[PDB]
From Swiss-Prot, chain A:
GO cellular component: plasma membrane; side of membrane
Domain of life, source organism: Eukaryota
GO biological process, one term: symbiont-mediated evasion of host immune response
Protein name: Variant surface glycoprotein MITAT 1.2
Organism: Trypanosoma brucei brucei
Keyword annotations: Cell membrane, Disulfide bond, Glycoprotein, GPI-anchor, Lipoprotein, Membrane, Signal, Trypanosomiasis
Subcellular location: Cell membrane
Primary localization class, coarse: membrane
Positions glycosylated per UniProt: N263
Subunit structure: Homodimer.
Record has Lipoprotein as a keyword: yes
Known role: VSG forms a coat on the surface of the parasite. The trypanosome evades the immune response of the host by expressing a series of antigenically distinct VSGs from an estimated 1000 VSG genes.
Disulfide pairings: C15-C145, C123-C187
Length: 346, 334
């Protein structure tokens, strides 16, 4: 009935959203670290190729390794530029809009949770409208709903309750009076009228929106209305703008999956840096001299020779010595510097 | 008087915090981009040094440049590790904690702003408790108070209302009934009692906390209580924990100022990577004519003045990488 406390069908979808927004900072941290990890892997492959060219200086495969090294160095460089120019902004913006929306939702839910008069009458009711619900650990009436920002550790990004089209569980409600409102639980937050709602001497001046514009609370003895947020489009200045902002920011996320962080499958001439390096330093013809071909199969063969190349065993722990079994930028950089010292002495 | 709407002395301090928290994501973006930019500068110096060594391969100056290149390459590598592991965690945490707290505050303020019966009776009152305030643009009753998360662009945040000690404006209130509550504006959010407040058939079961535990609304006919947040201590499980979390996360920020992102003034033997390289590969006087910072900067000058027009005038990682690859090809000629 209008003006009565809210059964679980109303607030559980909000808990689900709040819980998923909690994971957006975790996914931002994951994505920033994943992008850094991919850069480091590119740099490692550049370092292995440069080491191979130092060890085998003066051979056609060494000159092939210089081309490989330059390629992966440029991949590492472009990943860092994309981290600076694009990913940083995307992940900060998703973290901020999601956390801000979660704060707006959680303040509303926390208010509902506390606004009660007994075990059977209050603003936050169970599925049948029988009892008011209580918070125990991170659950409310058995529903995961911490109403707090969890400690932030990296976690893979997931879009379940908030996805490409909007908030999947926040659909249009045709009969709020029976599906959201209980029959008898008293809740002054359910209405702006003064008899059973927020008004004191008289009705509120206007409708009041709550939870960042999700629920509209009339100043009359009528049921609430909710926004349908499951099929969103861009908007400005909406009463529910924080919902749109978080959706837009999450939708923009590309992760560490753009071309800068991905390895290239094209033929050798089409790989980053190859053609220009062959032009400036050496000038299809020049490439078969060093890869014995110009397709990805020959590139893979050079990478295999690079990976199987052992380094001097004094350079590693008492540890494998093949370059493909070594990882870590700083470690491979210091090995390259060792071989550049040897090269200079010659 | 107890159970009346809130004068500006109550909510303007919350606006001031809400506005300042708005810029914490901007500081996170600023710091992350600045860190990346510093890594790129380290890598440029590592590349210039390597190019110098390829051009002059066979001289002790080139051996010095190999040492220099290794140093800056390791600095760039270490900067990426710190960005990945420390700065990203710091700045995401400051962004999340400040934005979350700002949402808690803004929802509460937005509720007060709308809960009114007239131009003179409602939950959000002006300084003298005469008028209910209205929101126009980014101000409420003339107070900066957008109640929105602004578009995120790089910016260094203020530390006026949230600083090292806490929330300076959120001090203990000795007389809320007269300083916070108006004398006659009606506001059911000021109390949990049923006559003038949130209760319907009777008073609410318990006191209600609002604004992430900042304000406690009694279920009796008494004035609100507020938490003093101006001299915080690290705690957990507090009713006002979100305030603690954002204070701690902001206070923990170093910016892109840790050693990984910064050049070193130590003597050459103490610079990153130098001793390990000298030990394995090879004394510093044979290449730098000394072992103090002055001899390091001397070699850096030689590197910067080397024509390719001068290395010191070239910048950009990918550009300098392709130049280095050209001279490595040239070396492979010999
Ligand atoms: C860590 O320290 C490294 C060494 O200081 C930094 O690398 C240096 O970066 C600066 C700025 O990018 C470069 O300085 C440039 O030098 C050129 C050449 O200057 C000379 O020639 C011009 C023109 O004839 C003349 O006007 C000058 O007075 C000089 O006589 C300038 O044109 C540029 O404006 C700029 O000043 C250094 O060359 C470069 N050094 C090395 C060894 O690469 C590094 O960026 C620092 N790291 C961080 C993160 O800041
Ligand atoms: C882009 O592709 C390159 C390969 O062309 C990746 O570098 C490669 O990384 C793998 C795994 O880290 C290395 O594999 C190693 O192979 C040996 C073979 O015996 C095996 O024993 C090792 O346990 C390991 O599996 C491989 O050596 C290395 N290749 C080169 C040339 O360094 C690179 O990581 C890729 N980039 C990204 C972002 O994934
Ligand atoms: Ca019922
Ligand atoms: Ca008054």
């Amino acid at each position: 009935a209008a003006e009565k406390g809210f059964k679980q069908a109303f607030w559980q979808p909000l808990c689900q959203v709040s819980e998923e927004l909690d994971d957006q900072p975790k996914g931002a941290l994951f994505t920033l670290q994943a992008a850094a990890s991919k850069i480091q892997k590119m740099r490692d492959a550049a370092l292995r190729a440069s080491i191979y060219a130092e060890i085998n200086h003066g051979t056609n495969r060494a000159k092939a390794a210089v081309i490989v090294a330059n390629h992966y160095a440029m991949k590492a460089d472009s990943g860092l530029e994309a981290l600076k120019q694009t990913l940083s902004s995307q992940e900060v913006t998703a973290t901020a809009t999601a956390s801000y929306l979660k704060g707006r939702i959680d303040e509303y839910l926390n208010l509902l949770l506390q606004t009660k008069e007994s075990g059977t009458s209050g603003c936050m009711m169970d599925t049948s409208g029988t009892n008011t619900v209580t918070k125990a650990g991170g659950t409310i009436g058995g529903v995961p709903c911490k109403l707090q920002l969890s400690p932030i550790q990296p976690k893979r990004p997931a879009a379940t309750y908030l996805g490409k089209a909007g908030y999947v569980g926040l659909t249009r409600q045709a009969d709020a009076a029976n599906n959201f409102h209980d029959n008898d639980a008293e809740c002054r937050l359910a209405s702006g009228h003064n008899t059973n709602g927020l008004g004191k001497s008289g009705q509120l001046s206007a409708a009041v929106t709550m939870a960042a514009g999700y629920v509209t609370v009339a100043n009359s003895q009528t049921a609430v209305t909710v926004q349908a947020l499951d099929a969103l489009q861009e908007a400005s200045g909406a009463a529910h703008q924080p919902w749109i902002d978080a959706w837009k920011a999450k939708k923009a996320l590309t992760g560490a999956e753009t071309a800068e962080f991905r390895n290239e499958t094209a033929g050798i001439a089409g790989k980053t840096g190859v053609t220009k390096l062959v032009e400036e330093a050496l000038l299809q013809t020049e490439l078969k001299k060093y890869f014995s071909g110009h397709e990805n199969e020959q590139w893979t063969a050079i990478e295999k020779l690079i990976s199987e190349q052992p380094v001097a065993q004094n350079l590693v722990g008492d540890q494998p010595t093949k370059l493909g079994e070594l990882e870590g930028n700083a470690k491979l950089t210091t090995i390259l510097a060792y071989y550049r010292m040897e090269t200079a002495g010659k």
